[PDB]
Amino acid sequence: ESIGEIMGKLMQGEIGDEELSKRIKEIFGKRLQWGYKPTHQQQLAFNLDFIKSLKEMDYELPSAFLEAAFGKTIKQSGCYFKDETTTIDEAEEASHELYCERAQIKDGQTVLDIGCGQGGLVLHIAQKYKNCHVTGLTNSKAQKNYILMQAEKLQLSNVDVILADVTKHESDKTYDRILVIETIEHMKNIQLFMKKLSTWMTEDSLLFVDHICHKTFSHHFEAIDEDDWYSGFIFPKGCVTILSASALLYFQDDVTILDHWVVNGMHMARSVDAWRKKLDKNMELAREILLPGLGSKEAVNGVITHIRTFCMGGYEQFSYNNGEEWMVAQMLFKKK
């Protein structure tokens, strides 16, 4: 069976969930085979080669659709589920609280959220800590607009948003706290990224990074072989990197580690499951919302298939071996 053939049936909704999940799990299984080495000697050689290679490098969905698919604050990162019955809205809030705890946020601090998305964390910190000034930075005008509208509705006076490609942003401004929640995976050059972040810190600042990871090895999110129809469908341009849980420890030229955690992958699995189920529940509404801006029922079905498959695939990835393969890494740093 060719890619063309599988992609044919997928787009037509002719692959049932059972088969789809099975096919994607197999693809992730091959990545694990690729990544695990027989000895720690070989594992470190593999991992350091990856790390060295990084050092050589360098239409938007309507907000109504996003609201029908994601949780209340449209968080687009792994959330944290205390209970079986925890809702996605509760899991968003719990995840925001965990970041505030681990990044040691205190009232009165200046806070920068890099790649802030729809601004759930910016709005959380602004509401919880009235004397903080909170700045989100995003490369999306639509996201900036959404955040400023929400801050207005919430009567928040302590929020601003920088519209910038972070890789190009130049400023003399420093911040007490810099937060990077699942943004670093999108970064082309990571030695240069951490260096830039360090110039926006003082000796009193902390930097908190959260990134999807594998516990043992790093990889680009790209086709494992010629049979892999999934990876390139999800990221057809690519430029998503899955660092190992310890990869950023090798990027301490300009910052120094203070603490290090991981969150088991079942939290991410439950996040993507909640998105998939909500999209499914709101399927008719979603198709209605998208149609104006996409111009045909076929183009709508395509966008929806892509998002739904991303959630179905993410479920297999992060739930693999009960959350003990792909998971979320978190690190706290100070400036050199």
φ/ψ bin of 100: left (φ > 0), alpha (ψ from -120 to 50), beta (otherwise): alpha
Q: Which of 109, 150, 183, 309 is the binder for ligand SAH (CB under 6 A)?
A: 183
For its own copies, give the closer residue by CB, 7 or 257: 257
Q: How far is the CB of 281 from ligand SAH (least distance, A)?
A: 21
Count of residues binding its own copies (CB under 8 A)? Answer: 25
121 vs 66: CA distance, rounded Å: 16
Tokens of 10: 């997928």
Is 262 exposed, middle or buried (CB count within 10 Å of its CB: 0-12, 13-18, 19+)?
Answer: middle
| H/E element, 263 | strand 255-263
- The answer to whether 166 contacts ligand SAH (rule: CB under 6 A) is yes
Cα distances (angstroms) measured from residue 214 to each of 59, 128, 168, 211: 31, 32, 29, 10
Report 103-162 residues binding its own copies (CB under 8 A): none
Q: 239 catalytic, yes or no?
A: no
Which of its own copies, ligand SAH, none lies near 245, with the C-beta cut-off 5 to 8 A by kind?
its own copies
Which of its own copies, ligand SAH, none lies near 45, with the C-beta cut-off 5 to 8 A by kind?
its own copies
For its own copies, give the closer residue by CB, 195 or 287: 195
Q: How far is the CB of 256 from its own copies (least distance, A)?
A: 5
Count of residues binding ligand SAH (CB under 6 A)? Answer: 16
Q: Which of 54, 161, 162, 245 is the binder for its own copies (CB under 8 A)?
A: 245
Q: Judge whether 135 and 175 are in contact, CB under 8 Å.
A: yes
3-state DSSP call for residue 270?
A: helix
- The answer to whether 289 contacts ligand SAH (rule: CB under 6 A) is no
For ligand SAH, give the closer residue by CB, 136 or 323: 136
- The answer to whether 195 contacts its own copies (rule: CB under 8 A) is no
Burial code of 46-76, b = ≥16 C-beta within 10 A, e = fewer?
A: bbeebbeebeeeeeebebebbbbbbbebbbb
Which of ligand SAH, its own copies, none lies near 167, with the C-beta cut-off 5 to 8 A by kind?
ligand SAH
- The answer to whether 262 contacts its own copies (rule: CB under 8 A) is yes
Amino acid identity of 74? I
Q: Judge whether 96 and 120 are in contact, CB under 8 Å.
A: yes
Interface residues toward its own copies, by CB under 8 A: 39-41, 44-45, 48, 215, 245-246, 249-250, 252-253, 256-257, 259-264, 323-324, 327, 336
